[PDB]
Amino acid sequence: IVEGSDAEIGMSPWQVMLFRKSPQELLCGASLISDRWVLTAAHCLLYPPWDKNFTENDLLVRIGKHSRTRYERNIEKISMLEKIYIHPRYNWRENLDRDIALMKLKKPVAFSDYIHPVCLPDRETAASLLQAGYKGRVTGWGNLKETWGQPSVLQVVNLPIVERPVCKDSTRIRITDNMFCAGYKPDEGKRGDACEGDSGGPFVMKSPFNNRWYQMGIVSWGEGCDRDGKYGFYTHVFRLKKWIQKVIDQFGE
Amino acid sequence: XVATDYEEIPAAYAX
């Protein structure tokens, strides 16, 4: 997170850390959506162009964290993965369309003041909040600058959703309906963005009708970090809700 | 993806 701030304790209790076994390292962000299911970006696990192909046994999940490098004794919970599922039409060949994946935990995790699931949007929630100009919130342990460094605790930044055409007009990559873009415009004089390390974390909004937090996006890609005229791109969770439903319904819950 | 020192954890967690 570029131009963000330290989170408050317990501010994003659904925030998850995808952690590399060995070498022991921060791989990406992720989110807790039930006692046994985690949501992230497919590219955190699979990206043939860079020779990226992780497996269940390669990773660890850390939940309830605040501090980036410390092992938070008595606070954080660590789980192992039972199975990973990537969308069948995830497109790593060209634009990362459908960048989404679910992970089934080995055993359910218990909730606490620091660990609690976020909600997935319904059609109406989507309809009402996913509008240009509305702000959402991004979280993560990713880099602080495009070239710098790394933060000490979880960072947070609030960003506005951008009109599709502006999004299209900012890049040469081809945009799909399974994606949206967010950030301040150059004139705006307010900055912020996701960066390396933030990938696969949650883009969330708070409902003004029922006081709950919904995850509308997954951090997907950007061209650099925090550049002017550029924007971050996110997977559109609601448009992929069916695949989520299906998988959870067929392989437990 | 952007197109352009961790405390050890306890021995169990692995497997």
Partner: protein, 36 residues
């Protein structure tokens, strides 16, 4: 699990549940052309 989350989804033990607001949530709310 499946959309709209869980019964208790999206209500934080340290904020919503005790009726405390975090330091920036209002920015959000105000953007929706003024929250609840």
């Amino acid at each position: 699990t499946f959309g709209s989350g869980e019964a208790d989804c999206g209500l934080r033990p340290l904020f919503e549940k005790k009726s405390l607001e975090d330091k920036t949530e209002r920015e959000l709310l105000e953007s929706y052309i003024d929250g609840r």
